[PDB]
Design a protein around this ligand. Structure first.
Ligand SMILES: NC(=O)c1cccc2cn(-c3ccc([C@@H]4CCCNC4)cc3)nc12
Ligand SMILES: NC(=O)c1cccc2cn(-c3ccc([C@@H]4CCCNC4)cc3)nc12
Ligand SMILES: NC(=O)c1cccc2cn(-c3ccc([C@@H]4CCCNC4)cc3)nc12
Lengths: 147, 147, 147
């Protein structure tokens, strides 16, 4: 059929996404420290890195939805439907995180610390919510791969 | 450092951004054609290309605001302030275009054509608005490059 | 060298090539539009973009020929022999397309509309020939992959 090839591509996308997520978390740790130390040029560099990693996570989350939508067409069963539902919620959260990080990056560039700090704290909350969904998706794709 | 080094960096940034904008316009034209033709995998490819170019425009728009904020610190008048205000409005519009394109990409991945079409049409309107501001910023910067 | 690793690599190469072909078609659509509208600087940019994708397609065609030759040695059967023959015809055709695109670039640079129009028309014809060959190659590789 096709399910096994799709599942293999999904494994590769999620492994790449996890590395990118680790890089995003590291860049935002560094951004937070630069903000607290008042190092504006360092902050700008780490925010730019974070934005690049966030855009890459956005792409992988879209790819994940598309692959699971294809899986459900070729292997209809509530476990694939469940994985697709989780992936769609993850993508929604990732895009919320992305828009919020964008607001923080613009506020920092505009010299607007109040909006920066509010947006940054919102981003952290959304990133943690996305991590919960990502881990849940990973668990689910073990049913489907048969550990 | 000096107002001249800054203004020359800004010219390089805007030149690069214009090339990226041309590529974004071309990718979105191709997405529209694939959408009209019902070619879903082609549409996915072109939406991903569009999102990548949009991410790059976002980065250049941030860099433009940062450079004009630095120019204003170096020679504080009202011509620098006016350019910065235009660039800040451009960045806001760019980020609105980016969030709206992201919604369209997600809707397409989810097979929700109603949301896709609404978000894609909003993206086009925002893109045209951003083009107006980009051209306005370029005019303003010519009046600053006072040889 | 084993048959399955080579087929795997070929599948990846052809998927990457298809995305690049989509990008080449988009850049050439944009070039045609700029030409029709008299936007000469836009045309120049889009021709440079098209040439970049054309050079990438050329390299994927080279890689495909090399890989199919390897497949014939460790996996002799007349389908791989047919695939190599198609791939070599594709490589000849994409090189001819590259030459014609080069002529279009130089004609635009010289502002020689008569030569430009002839070269661009020839490019479109060669692009359609290459598309037929690429489709045949995809079908032959599907046959080889034996599910
Ligand atoms: N932002 C995302 O799209 C995203 C997707 C999936 C898992 C994610 C995990 N994060 C995440 C990103 C950053 C952080 C914080 C921010 C700074 C403090 N320590 C790390 C915590 C979680 N972001 C994720
Ligand atoms: N989207 C942006 O951030 C952006 C920034 C600056 C100038 C811009 C110009 N555009 C733009 C992008 C796409 C389009 C249309 C929409 C699709 C079909 N024809 C091209 C029109 C304008 N987007 C821009
Ligand atoms: N040029 C190539 O090497 C090539 C290789 C494989 C498949 C291809 C398909 N094309 C192609 C490229 C461009 C076009 C037209 C020409 C411009 C207006 N509409 C798109 C039609 C087909 N080019 C291909």
């Amino acid at each position: 059929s096709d399910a096994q090839e799709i599942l293999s591509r999904l494994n590769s996308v999620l492994e790449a996404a996890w590395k990118t997520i680790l890089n995003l978390a590291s860049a935002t740790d560094a951004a937070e420290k630069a903000y607290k130390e008042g190092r504006e040029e360092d902050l700008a560099t780490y925010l730019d890195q974070a934005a690049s990693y966030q855009s890459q996570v956005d792409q992988y989350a879209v790819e994940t939805v598309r692959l699971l939508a294809e899986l459900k067409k070729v292997f209809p069963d509530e476990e694939a439907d469940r994985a697709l539902q989780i992936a769609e919620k993850l993508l929604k959260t990732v895009q919320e995180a992305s828009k919020t990080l964008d607001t923080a990056v613009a506020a920092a560039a505009n010299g607007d610390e109040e909006t920066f700090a509010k947006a940054f704290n919102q981003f952290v909350s959304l990133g943690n919510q996305a991590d919960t969904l990502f881990t849940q998706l990973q668990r689910t794709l073990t049913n489907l791969n048969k550990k």
